[PDB]
Symmetry: none
Subunit: 82 residues, 23 copies
């Protein structure tokens, strides 16, 4: 489940890399969201939820931008076939 | 009625999570509001009403912000389709 | 007609508590005032009338101050709604 | 004329709840005010008038603050539409 | 009304897939919009309306991007005829 | 004067939906504003005026945000023509 | 010239209520003051004058306090417009 | 000089509505202020002056808050042009 | 002034189709713009102006994109003459 | 029924903490108020009643201010979600 | 030197109104104070001095309160500029 | 100095339309600002100044947004030349 | 050493007015007190001493009350600064 | 030193307008403050000082709010350059 | 050590103005207090001490209120920086 | 042990000033009281005792009033901190 | 300096047509830019500058696109020489 | 548990830094809150509670603002990927 | 049963301090009152009764004033929580 | 235990400064309160107790206001982080 | 140092135009900032500083937006080279 | 340690300018705070402390707002890089 | 570690330039963040932290935008290879 600029990997492999490399964060975010839905008035809970949510959004954006850039590169090389 | 960063859930599922995870609070707030409308002069009643109202506002704001952030993330990923 | 710092009572309930808890005193004061208006020269009558009148004034002042303080507390809590 | 945090009610419904839940108090206050305007020298009358007036002011303030808070919440959610 | 990367389907078939696969959501959004136009002050109503509207916008954007990408692919293949 | 996510409606139709679905509220607000301009010292009048004004502002904001979002969606689809 | 916590009255209406509800007392006080200015040595005259003057002062104070409290309530509600 | 939530009115129209709907009150306040400046020792004069002054302040505050709220709504709609 | 994918029409015919099919909207927008230039403070006026302006921009963009696409198709066919 | 700045508690928990931590005081105040309503002329009784009433008002104010401050903090953190 | 709720006056104009509308009273008070400082034992002199002094204090208090209230109103309107 | 979605007008024509359609308002605002700079303590003056200033800001914002949107449309059409 | 309700005087000026306006009386009282301390048995001496002493006490009381009242007025105006 | 919504003026011009249009008031306030620092016990002096100070604060607040609003408008227009 | 609403002064300058403008009064009060502490039985001494003490309290209150008001104005202007 | 309205002194310093400035009087009063308790029938003794007792009461009252006034001034200034 | 699809014109002729047909606009833009560089705080100035700048950018883009398209056409015809 | 602008840390690391760097303060606040809930009448207790509560609110606000700013920076950098 | 300005005491503790620190005096007063009710003609008895009664009244007043002042201080600190 | 506007101190440090800088006063007040609870009839004792109590209240108020102001400043700076 | 849409100028020339056309304003802002850093309590100083700072921010924003727009235009023309 | 809108300075330079330009004020405030912590009962001390504290708060707020505004301007220019 | 538009450098070289040219600022920010996490209540600390944080965000944004622009230029040149 690793990725190297060498002979073999793929885009779905990059997405799986982004998912698995940041996995426990998703479970922590799930748990924090549950606790928040229980009682939305505990400050420490709110701070942890904010941190986790921000990190999750950053992860999603980074993954999507990386996939987009790599697809653009590949489509650029393909066109040079002819 | 649970939500996990896994294969399947949705925004309306998040709203329903926020609603059901904090449900008895809404009934308590209803009852306290009724009692308050009966006699607006009992201090204990006022304190309980204040606590419940504050918690309710916090819940609404948290739910709305979470929905907004997730929609922003999704709209960000969609645009990277092309 | 009792009052407890618990779920339900009101200001008018406090006034009624002050009135009913000190009731026979009011009838005694009425009777003494009548007798005094009959013949204002009996010393024992004067002493009893003085005692009853003083106690009545004390009761009125205490009731009014208590009502005022409780209303102030309630108006203080209400403002903290927002 | 009841209100529940469920599918349907409105702000005017909250105001009507505050009005109807505390209705006989308004008639009592009217009657006491009339009697007071007749003869402003009866202590029991004054005590009852004070109690009723205080309770009425508390009711007005509580209703107004509740309406304000709910409107603030609604305007907060609306802005998250976009 | 299904679509598979096999011998037969079309672009309009993709649009119909997007429409029919997300159909009840459109009726729910219609109903919520109607209720909102009735009384724009119920928080639960606002939350449901926000969720449905966000999901609808996401659906429209995804459908349009998918159609665009597939048309681009087809126009790319056509040009390689000669 | 109804609107459904089906073959035919328009933006002006949405605005007319918002206007007609909340119509009697506008007349009530007019009447309350007139009465207020007559004598700005009746508490019940003030409470009703506050409720109606708040609801009116909420309606305006919701209508404007909905129109904005739908126009954004339409302009997004149009650009995918080419 | 009556006042009820219902749709219509005003502050000046409250002042007129206090004035008209206690009217004959003012004429009696005028007459007693005149007689007193004639001969300030009749005990019965002095007692009646004392009673009337005390009642008049009580009426003025009660009216002023009521007007003040109602104005405070109204100014409190007005501020919650925004 | 009337105002209706219909096709045509303006902010200055609202201010003129507040002014003209409460006009005789301003003349009465002028006259009472003049009389007060003549002899500041007549109780009835003082009570009428207090009532009129309080009502005038309430009118000013209500007018200003209404204008502010409507301007806020209009500036909110304008921004949604783009 | 109709257009069909059949033997005869032209690009200017498409532009005229877009213009005439959406004509009354242009007059309504003119009138609304005039009224707005008169008094830029009527909320209903602002909402109608926003709706009309948005629809007009959408119409312009759609017309331009359609003309562009058809010209591209025609220039593609012409080149295949040789 | 304890509260710690750690993973879990809530606003209603703070109110219950204030109530239960100062409980016997409320019963003592009830008893003293009853005795006072019996005979409002015993100095020791008056002193004890004054002490208890003052302490009760202090407790109410402190609880309300604490709840208000914590709600403000929580609403501040929530807004930083986005 | 008159003042009307119309287009033009000012606070200093109100103070000058209070001063000039009650002017001869100030000279009378000066003369009475001088005579009193001459011989503080003439009863008629004492009565006139008491009347004038009381009226003067009333005038000062009324002027100051009026100025304060009007300044408060003006500062309230100014803040609604933005 | 009129503008119609027909053969001929321009952006500067739109700006001149906004200026001339709302012209007397600018003179009124000038006069009110002058009077305010004279004596900043007349409530009616303050209310009129607030109304005029708010309307002026609304006019400026609306004009600027309209110009921006039309320029965006024109720049969109220009790019479709090629 | 005169005092007028005009632009300039002070409290110490009032005290000096009371002292100097009644000055020869103080010397006469001194002389009479000396003579009395010589031989306390001359009736005419006693009558003159009684008259002078009474007038002196009246002067002191009047001066002190006037100073107190003026200080109260000034402290009342000062507080209205804010 | 005048300002008109026409081709040329500036923010500093608005500040200078506020300063020069209310200039003699500043000198009067200086003189009154000096006199007050001399002898803080003359009632007329106190009343004039209160009036001038209140008017000065109103002027400062109005000037600052106007400058703020105009700067906001200008910064809004600037951003629409692109 | 003078102060003018012109380019340069400060709060401490206002305090020093209040101190130096009323300086000899402080020395006189010191001397009178010393004499009073010597023999608290001379009426003239008591009258002078009362006058000086009253004037001193008035000076302190006026200075403090002026400083407070000016600080409030300055803090109001500062916030309008942004 | 002196006190001056300058940089440093305190309330206890004022009390000590009152005590030490009138010290020998206290010893004289002690001695006179002792002698009086010995033989309460010597006229000269009675006159001296009366004089000393009166002066002592005057001293106590003056000290207490001065302390009260200064504390009031200080508490007034403190509140103007905010 | 005119251009017609007839026997004679050129690309530089098209550029000169674009320049001369829109000439006064360039001078107006120069003047407005100068005035803006003088004082960047006049709203009318900002609006005119925005309009002129937008129109100038549109003109540049249109000219460049037209030149590009005509050059492409000419280069297309040239290649068909052989 | 330290954080440095170097190769490795995260948002949750910043939150944990804020929590652990200010830890004993939270326990002290817990203890003080408990003691306060016991007896809300000890001044030293109140002062310590006020200090701790203020510091806690400051800590929460600072942590939240820092997290928000860093997330904004990160989301800014991510977008520059393409 | 001692009280120190240190970590722990309360208002009721102050009342108990006043009661227990002066306890034997109450028993002595009881005994003296009994003896007086037996035979109200013994001079020594009367003197002792007068002394004890005076001391008791002083104790009550001092206790009440101390409690009042401390409650005022505590309520002052509480309000500074926010 | 000193505090300087330099690199390091805190709010609790300010409270400790207020406590330790005024420490012996607290012990003196304790001792005086004890003595007073012993015998509430010694005038010198009463004067010392009054002085100490007044100074203590002043100290508490000053400390609380200073802490409040500094917390307000800090919370103001924190918000400017973003 | 002038700029005209004619044969020769550049971007740095535009920046220098913005700098030199608004130069004295920068020196005035420097001087005002220095004076403010000296004594931040002079209202006139604060008003001038606010005006200058606002104008400076407006100038910076306008310059930056103009440079951005012109660079965009130039980069648009360059791409049409081929 | 000076700052000019010229080639070189920075934000920390602005903060240092605010600190050093107002430096002696900080030492004076330190000294006054120390003296106040010694004896909180000297009026002159209280007045000086109030003045210094107010000026310090003003300085902090002004510095923070200036830094915020300049950072906003810089972040605005940076974004126009692309 | 320098960079010049000459024969050799790279993007990572630009990032390293941005990092090393602003290095001590990062250490200062680290230290300030640590101190802040210690005690979030020192104003000078808060001001320094705000300045450093703002400068850091500006640096990050500038670096990212520069890298983005240079990459865009390079990708533009590469495409012109063919």
């Amino acid at each position: 489940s690793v990725t190297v600029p060498n002979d073999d990997w793929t885009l779905s492999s990059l997405s799986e890399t982004f998912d698995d490399g940041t996995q426990t964060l998703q479970g922590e975010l799930t748990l924090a969201l549950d606790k928040l839905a229980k009682n939305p008035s505990n400050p420490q809970l709110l701070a942890e939820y904010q941190s986790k949510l921000s990190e999750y959004t950053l992860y999603r954006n980074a993954q999507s931008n990386t996939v987009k850039v790599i697809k653009d590169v590949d489509a650029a090389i393909i066109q040079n076939f002819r």
